[PDB]
Design a protein around this nucleic acid. Structure first.
Lengths: 56, 152, 159, 68, 118
RNA sequence: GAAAGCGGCUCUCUGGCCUGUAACUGACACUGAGGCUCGAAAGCGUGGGGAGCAAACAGGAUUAGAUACCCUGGUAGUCCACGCCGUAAACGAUGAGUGCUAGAUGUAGGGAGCUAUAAGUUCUCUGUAUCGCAGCUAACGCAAUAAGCACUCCGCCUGGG
């Protein structure tokens, strides 16, 4: 499971581990978009051409 | 405006050997009275010549240390959120602002002559304390509030 | 507020509807902070009111804005034009208050259609390269003709 | 470089829940699923697997919540 | 004449909120004697999550950890913010022994409704 | 799924299609006023459950002012069984049935081949896009899931308030 530690990591090396890998965690987008609650017809404004703009 | 449009240059001194002799003329000299201005500047290294009799650059350069701060300020807003994000400009402009400082306190003192209240601030510049070091620490203490750079 | 300059510039001045001016700019003194200076400057002419010109200028302490506008009646110009000053301050709410408003390019072959390996002699001569970037139509796959340094038709070919 | 859906690799149909990580490399490093875009999945065949992964995530044979 | 300890592997509970940050240094399960926040210091205003102010917030209790007498750190960060990063490099460089910066920001799954529109 | 809508997981009984198929009925077809059913969202009835959220209202900024946006809260209400309203941008402001047909195109899941020492392609059906032939309109645009060309069931519409 959680190793929390890159292989003999340094300070800036673990900083780049958490920046890189914890930036690819997805741990921030759902939170900042979960600042406030929204209407479920706005939840499918979320489930719309943002993701279709991402892939296509 | 758009460009780095050119500045101008006055010549350095051959008498006491400083360009801030004639730049001290560039702040004390009003109505273009350059000969009276050199009478005050040469009279001020004469004020050194009674007090210490040393080189002009001891009092003049220790004074420069007193009146050249590290940091200056700038207005930078988000949409009104005026983070006073600072800068540290180069010694021609820092020396220029110190020349505003010595023309300020060495001008606006109610004493007898220009060389007498400028004897108060060139001689108290030889006392190298008080108004000048506070006149830069008034911006130096602000820098901890100027800690923000472009953050939010 | 601080100061006026009431000026009827064609007809004499009468302080009933000028007092009505003074009261709607009294409502400027409901929307004031320092009513620094104003000036009435009005103009009515002959031929049974084929115009009604009025004016008041507004040098406040930060903004300046005048008003030389019309109606048929001068009373209606005082009405609709000082109401226009009310709606101007209604335009001047956010314009006053809301000072916040809130090496090698990693890419494929740039050519589209495939050209055969004999055409690579012309395809090297097409764009001006010593090689010839062309998906081979004759040879199954990709082929290219280089320039050997002896001077003959070269071939940059895995082949 | 193919590496799509693993379906032609474990061809066919088995199980898709009685592996440990043979099917469950579909996990992310943070206990969630690999993307249908990075994996780039055949949609309802991915549903033919994920419709029992959603079981097998949380059947107490697998850490359903994790990080790193 | 008070009870004191000499622990070495403290557990550094630092919560970066989206307005402030506590900087805490903890026992083995634990509990914190050497601990602080940004808002412990009077940086109340726009200065509430300046990251170098967060550096000194991640420095003050950090140097207060030697009252107990610990040098190696068992770091645990929770929550992001607008001052998190220079705090992270701060306690990565605060007279400490950075080996394990934990990341314990808890995650719901379409949980409670947040407060509404803005 | 007719829509309304429907997403932790597992069971229970549960419609509805499509692919093939002539095994079979032998036109049983399409509709659809009337009548009937279902049905957003709230709210209303009774009885619970009462985390978080939030009408009502309060406090603090806000400014001339704030009964508003922000913050602190915070009642109704949101959830569960149990009855009702029948009105929503009902939307795609595009009725229902079926026929016709340039193509570039998505993706499902079948049917078939298919590509074989494991690969990867072609046709077929309902799906849902995007461009665009023809046609097309006041223009905008539609165009195979036609705003094109037909017919049967219905419905609306008559200048504005």
């Amino acid at each position: 499971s959680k190793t929390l530690v890159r292989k003999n990591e340094s300070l800036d090396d673990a900083l780049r581990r958490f920046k890189r890998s914890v930036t690819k965690a997805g741990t921030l987008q759902e939170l900042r978009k979960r600042e406030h609650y929204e209407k479920p017809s706005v939840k499918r404004k979320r489930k719309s051409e943002a993701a279709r703009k991402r892939k296509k | 405006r758009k460009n780095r449009a050119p500045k101008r240059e006055v010549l350095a001194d051959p008498m006491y050997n400083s360009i801030v002799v004639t730049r001290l003329i560039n702040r004390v000299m009003l109505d273009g009275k350059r000969g009276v201005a050199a009478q005050i500047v040469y009279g001020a290294f004469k004020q050194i010549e009674e007090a210490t009799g040393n080189n002009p650059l001891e009092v003049f350069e220790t004074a420069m240390e007193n009146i050249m701060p590290v940091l200056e300020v700038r207005a930078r807003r988000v949409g009104g959120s005026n983070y006073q994000v600072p800068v540290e400009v180069r010694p021609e402009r820092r020396t220029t602002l110190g020349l505003r400082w010595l023309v300020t306190i060495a001008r606006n003192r109610g004493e007898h002559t220009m060389q007498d209240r400028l004897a108060k601030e060139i001689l108290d510049a030889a006392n190298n304390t008080g108004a000048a070091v506070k006149k830069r620490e008034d911006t130096h203490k602000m820098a901890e509030a100027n800690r923000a750079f472009a953050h939010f | 507020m601080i100061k006026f300059n009431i000026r009827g510039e064609n007809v004499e001045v009468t302080d009933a509807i000028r007092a009505y001016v003074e009261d709607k700019i009294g409502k400027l003194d409901k929307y004031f902070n320092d009513g620094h200076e104003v000036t009435a400057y009005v103009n009515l002419k002959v031929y049974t009111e084929k115009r009604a010109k009025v004016e008041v200028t507004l040098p406040a302490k930060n903004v300046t804005l005048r008003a030389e506008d019309t109606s048929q009646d001068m009373y209606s110009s005082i009405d609709f034009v000082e109401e226009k000053l009310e709606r101007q301050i209604r335009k001047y709410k956010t314009r006053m208050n809301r000072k916040p408003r809130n090496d090698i390019v990693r890419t494929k072959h740039v050519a589209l259609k495939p050209m055969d390996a004999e055409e690579a002699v012309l395809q090297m001569d097409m764009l001006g390269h010593d090689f010839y970037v062309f998906t081979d139509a004759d040879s199954n796959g990709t082929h290219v003709v280089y320039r050997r340094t002896d001077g003959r038709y070269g071939l940059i070919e895995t082949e | 470089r193919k590496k799509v859906d693993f379906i032609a690799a474990n061809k066919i149909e088995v199980v898709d829940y009685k592996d440990t990580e043979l099917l469950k490399r579909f996990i992310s490093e943070r206990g969630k699923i690999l993307p249908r875009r990075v994996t780039g999945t055949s949609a309802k065949n991915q549903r033919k697997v994920v419709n029992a992964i959603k079981r097998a995530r949380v059947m107490a044979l697998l850490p359903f919540v994790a990080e790193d | 004449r008070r009870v004191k300890k000499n622990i070495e592997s403290g557990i550094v509970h630092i919560q970066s909120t989206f307005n402030n940050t506590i900087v805490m240094i903890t026992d083995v399960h634990g509990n914190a004697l050497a601990w602080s926040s940004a808002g412990a210091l009077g940086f109340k205003g726009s200065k509430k999550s300046t990251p170098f102010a967060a550096q000194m917030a991640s420095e003050a209790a950090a140097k207060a950890a030697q009252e107990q007498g610990l040098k190696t750190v068992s770091v645990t960060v929770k929550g992001p913010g607008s001052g998190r990063e220079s705090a992270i490099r701060a306690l990565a460089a605060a007279g400490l022994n950075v080996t394990s910066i934990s990341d314990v920001t808890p995650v719901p799954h379409n949980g409670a409704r947040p407060p509404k529109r803005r």
